[PDB]
């Protein structure tokens, strides 16, 4: 885009679309912090996805697994791998795009202070029917033993509660700003005040 850092809250987003939108932006040019990446959705079922990951694990090398593939277990790394698949990563242009991507499970607090964006076409609600089975990427990762989950669960809750305290304070501040604005709208010269009202204040 046209901004230093996009932060993306990746909860409720569907894997392929989330990856594709991120990738084209990286190619266009953008540093992108993918945040909250266990709450990504895969469209398959839990068993079906477990089967797919089983096939992925089965793929290795006869020769020497020291020169084998990487079976990354982090849900963030799973997204990263998918984005890597959607990049020409054996190039320099692809490598630069690859370097621009940053991935994190849960909300890292320096980037929770920052604004979070979402990708509106990529939500589970948006492109999947209600009555058709799906599975959360963190749930699948837990099933195949990533197991760094409870710590994040505790951390996210603590962050969210503080965010509630922050939100109420923000609401308090905004309400007070509205109150002073409405009072001091009277003090404006009539014509100017009428113009400002006309254009939506």
């Amino acid at each position: 885009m046209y901004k230093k850092e996009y932060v993306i809250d990746c909860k409720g987003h569907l894997l392929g679309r989330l990856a594709s939108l991120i990738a084209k932006e990286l190619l266009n040019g953008q540093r992108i912090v993918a945040v909250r990446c266990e709450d990504i959705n895969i469209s398959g079922s839990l068993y079906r996805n477990k089967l797919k990951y089983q096939e992925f694990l089965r793929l290795r090398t006869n020769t020497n697994p020291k020169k084998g593939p990487l079976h990354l277990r982090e849900p963030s790394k799973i997204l990263w791998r998918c984005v890597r698949g959607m990049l020409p990563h054996k190039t320099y242009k692809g490598q630069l795009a690859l370097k621009k991507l940053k991935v994190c499970v849960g909300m890292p607090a320096p980037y929770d202070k920052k604004k979070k964006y979402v990708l509106p076409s990529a939500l589970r609600a948006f492109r999947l029917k209600k009555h058709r089975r799906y599975c959360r990427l963190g749930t699948l990762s837990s099933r195949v033993g990533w197991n760094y989950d409870t710590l994040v669960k505790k951390n996210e809750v603590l962050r969210k509660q503080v965010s509630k305290a922050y939100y109420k304070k923000k609401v308090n501040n905004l309400n007070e700003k509205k109150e002073i604005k409405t009072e001091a709208l009277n003090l404006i010269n009539p014509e100017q005040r009428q113009v400002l009202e006309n254009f939506g204040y």
Binding site: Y2, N28, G29, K93
Partner: protein, 103 residues
């Protein structure tokens, strides 16, 4: 503040590629606001300036410029073809460009 910019922002994308084929005569430009052919058509004839920073003093200065002009779209989402007076470098792909308000 002190400066007033008086252009709109863009991103110099690649040259006018097609799958596994290159045309270097035409360059592809992303203009920040646009997302349609119809909206892009408003800006179609405008003069475009690529300004860039260098290591040594040239004519006493470390800033240089390439000029081009927008001329036709490259898609329904308003990504636009621009023809330049000399080809812009692949080194400058993903860099910023200035789209002037004239003619």
């Amino acid at each position: 503040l002190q400066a007033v910019r008086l252009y709109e922002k863009g991103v110099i994308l690649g040259y006018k590629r097609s799958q596994r084929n290159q045309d270097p005569n035409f360059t592809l430009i992303s203009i920040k606001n646009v997302n349609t052919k119809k909206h892009a058509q408003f800006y179609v004839g405008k003069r475009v300036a690529y300004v860039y920073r260098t290591t040594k003093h040239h004519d006493g200065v470390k800033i240089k410029c390439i000029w081009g002009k927008v001329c036709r779209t490259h898609g329904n989402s308003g990504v636009i073809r621009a023809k330049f007076k000399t080809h812009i470098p692949p080194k400058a792909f993903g860099d910023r460009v200035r789209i002037l308000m004239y003619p």
